[PDB]
Design a protein around this nucleic acid. Structure first.
Lengths: 141, 183, 89, 54, 189, 49
RNA sequence: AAGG
RNA sequence: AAGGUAAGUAU
């Protein structure tokens, strides 16, 4: 949660999105002190080395950097968004919101699969990718 | 354009065009007749288009398609004519449809005093006219029947007319003379 | 110097080219392409309704040195219009 | 300017409507975390002696 | 330093104009307008709790309204003397039972009363002029109902009688035994 | 009496009993009045309608 | 290309 | 009330 790089103003976020031309820019919008953000950041930290070939992970504090709250509807405790070549890559998670991951995941392989799907779809030149797993339900039994 | 002219004042505490439902207003604004022959209309141009009217009605068909009469009514609501212009519309004798358009506008925007002062004298007209039903069919009625519907029916030509103080209520306060019919 | 809005004295031939087929190549500019075109505003519109919206738009009137404001009519000219229309028929 | 004045007036009004039980419930909360804190100390407190030896 | 009451025509004019937000004249200051709109449930609650009773034709209530007409509150709590209120509602019960027995066909109201695209009526030009219809009121015998007859079927009865109430606040009531017996007889149902 | 009105009586009694059990004395508070504070600010005027 |  | 947005390029 604290081992990941941080972006401290909107210009830094724009540059991080613009800098990467061959990798998915995974940016988590939230607060390091929020428990949901702590879970999501732990998951991202567990996979940060694995996906470094095709993904880069940044963390942004939405109070320190409020320049995207109105734009990206960052009014949730945690939010993960995907950008590839200065384009926001939407993902059809099945949750009704195709723009972001607004909850916290528990499986590293889940997040890695989502990142890989986003990377492949964005490389092919697509603005929306279909998630390998549906999230219309939590699969709790 | 599409908005109310700047010099126009509010009617019934709302926008002058708001006397028509937003559904019907949106349908009229998207109609071919409104976009073609009602892009810019002054009182002279409204008079010119009024005589071309062949029927009176609201909307027809399964999809809401407005008649030219409704489009002209909404245009006159948009660009406000003075009261004497409305009277001159009503005072017209050669064309029945122009007088009906003026009477409908007076009922929509005029005071409850005006709705009986200027529309009740039109009961003397019994000219046959064609009225288009909501199914697209046309039916024959008379001028006096249209005036009676204006003065007594809540919804005329798919427009919910503003509330009128009842005639006996107006007579009791004696600010309006009781109607004396010709018969 | 924005003149007040005026009614179009001319009808628009929306249905003039019904059924016709127009051949368009790479060299052909926007002037002779299919659909509706206005030189005043130099644009191509492939609809009758959208063309009516365009010719009723702010930019089209502005390119004509005009304004969306419509002049308030006077009683005398309305009465004279009634008189001349009655005399015509 | 006047927008800020109206916002401040409404905020002060909302704060005043909260004074009915604000101090009572806040002192209850203060006396309730300390009841919970003795049984469940803060994590940093449990490492205070070890941290000092660093 | 106390706020004097405004004439009822002031709020009438304020509501009559500024009706549509489309007007750009008063759009300069909207934080004062918007900030007072969150209390709409309070206005709803105060309005419905001050609803006139079947024995009352017109109920003039103190009104606290925003300076821009954004919201209007009924600044009144419906205090009612419990024996008087119970007796009034018992007489109402008698009247409605007798009306249902007597009237051959009862025409239930049509809900909603008005069309959905019909705008709300202007009070000044539709209700201010028309005289109210007769309310429900049980006939009181001048012989046996004399202790209560004068002030019965009144909004906050005996509000000005310092012998029977503390004052205009309408908090305490001290009633004579004949009035209590008459109210008790009127509320047997 | 019909079954529905008997169930009505029983449900009304259930609500009465539940209200009686769940009753707790009101918590002590400072008297703050919303409408009185409305009158204090200049944004609200008073009338009778 | 048109709408607030 | 939702878990039912194709991603676009043109005008």
């Amino acid at each position: 949660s604290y081992m990941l790089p941080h972006l401290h103003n909107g210009w830094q976020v724009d540059q991080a999105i613009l800098s990467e031309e061959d990798r998915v820019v995974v940016i988590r919008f939230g607060h390091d002190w929020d428990p949901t953000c702590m879970k999501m950041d732990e998951v991202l930290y567990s996979i940060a080395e694995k996906v470094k070939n095709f993904a880069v992970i940044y963390l942004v504090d939405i109070t320190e950097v409020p320049d995207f709250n109105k734009m990206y509807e960052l009014y949730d405790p945690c939010t993960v968004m995907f950008f590839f070549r200065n384009k926001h890559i939407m993902i059809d998670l099945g949750t009704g919101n195709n723009n972001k991951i607004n909850w916290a995941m528990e499986d590293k392989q889940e997040m890695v699969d989502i990142i890989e799907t986003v990377y492949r779809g964005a490389r092919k030149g697509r603005g929306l990718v279909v998630s390998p797993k549906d999230y219309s339900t939590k699969y709790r039994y | 354009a599409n908005r109310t002219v700047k010099d126009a004042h509010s009617i019934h505490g709302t926008n002058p065009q708001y006397l028509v439902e937003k559904i019907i207003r949106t349908r009229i604004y998207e109609s071919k007749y409104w976009k073609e022959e009602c892009f810019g209309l002054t009182a002279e141009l409204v008079v010119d288009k009024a005589m071309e009217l062949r029927f009176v009605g609201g909307v027809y068909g399964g999809n809401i398609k407005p008649t030219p009469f409704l489009c002209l009514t909404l245009k006159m609501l948009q660009i406000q004519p003075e009261k004497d212009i409305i009277v001159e519309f009503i005072k017209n004798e050669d064309f029945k449809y122009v007088r009906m358009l003026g009477a409908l506008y007076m009922r929509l925007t005029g005071t409850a005093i005006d709705c009986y002062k200027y529309l009740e004298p039109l009961y003397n007209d019994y000219r046959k006219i064609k009225s288009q039903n909501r199914n697209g069919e046309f039916e024959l009625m008379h001028v006096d029947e249209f005036i009676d519907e204006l003065l007594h029916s809540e919804r005329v030509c798919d427009i919910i007319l503003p509330r009128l103080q009842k005639r006996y209520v107006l007579e009791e306060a004696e600010q309006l003379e009781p109607r004396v019919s010709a018969l | 110097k924005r003149e007040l809005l005026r009614h179009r004295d001319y009808k628009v031939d929306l249905e003039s080219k019904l059924g016709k087929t127009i051949v368009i190549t790479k060299t052909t500019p926007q002037s002779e392409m299919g659909g509706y075109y206005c030189n005043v505003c130099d644009c191509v519109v492939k609809d009758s309704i959208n063309f009516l919206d365009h010719i009723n738009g702010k930019k089209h009137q502005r390119n004509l040195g005009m304004s969306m404001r419509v002049e308030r009519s006077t009683l005398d000219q309305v009465k004279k219009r009634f008189e001349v229309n009655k005399k015509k028929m | 300017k006047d927008d800020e004045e109206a916002d401040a007036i409404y905020a002060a009004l909302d704060k005043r409507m909260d004074e009915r039980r604000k101090e009572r419930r806040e002192q209850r909360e203060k006396e309730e975390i300390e009841k919970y804190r003795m049984e469940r100390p803060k994590i940093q407190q449990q490492f205070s002696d070890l941290k000092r030896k660093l | 330093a106390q706020k004097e009451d405004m004439p009822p025509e002031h709020v009438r004019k304020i509501i009559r104009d500024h009706g549509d937000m489309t007007n750009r004249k008063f759009r300069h200051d909207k934080r004062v307008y918007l900030g007072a709109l969150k209390y709409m449930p309070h206005a709803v609650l105060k309005l419905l709790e001050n609803m006139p009773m079947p024995w009352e034709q017109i109920r003039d209530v103190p009104v606290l309204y925003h300076i821009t007409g954004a919201i209007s509150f009924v600044n009144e709590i419906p205090w009612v003397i419990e024996p008087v209120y119970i007796s009034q509602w018992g007489s109402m019960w008698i009247m409605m039972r007798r009306e249902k027995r007597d009237r051959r066909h009862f025409k239930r109201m049509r809900f909603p009363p008005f069309d959905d695209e019909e705008p709300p009526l202007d009070y000044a030009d539709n209700i201010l002029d028309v005289e109210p219809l007769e309310a429900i009121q049980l006939e009181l015998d001048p012989e046996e109902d004399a202790p209560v007859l004068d002030w019965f079927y009144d909004h906050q009865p005996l509000r000005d009688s310092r012998k029977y109430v503390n004052g205009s606040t309408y908090q305490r009531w001290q009633f004579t035994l004949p009035m209590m017996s008459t109210l008790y007889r009127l509320a047997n149902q | 009496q019909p079954v529905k009105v008997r169930v009505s009586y029983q449900k009304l009694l259930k609500y009465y009993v539940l209200n009686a059990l769940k009753h707790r004395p009101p918590k002590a508070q400072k008297k703050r009045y919303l409408f009185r504070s409305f009158k204090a600010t200049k944004f609200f005027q008073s009338t009778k309608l």
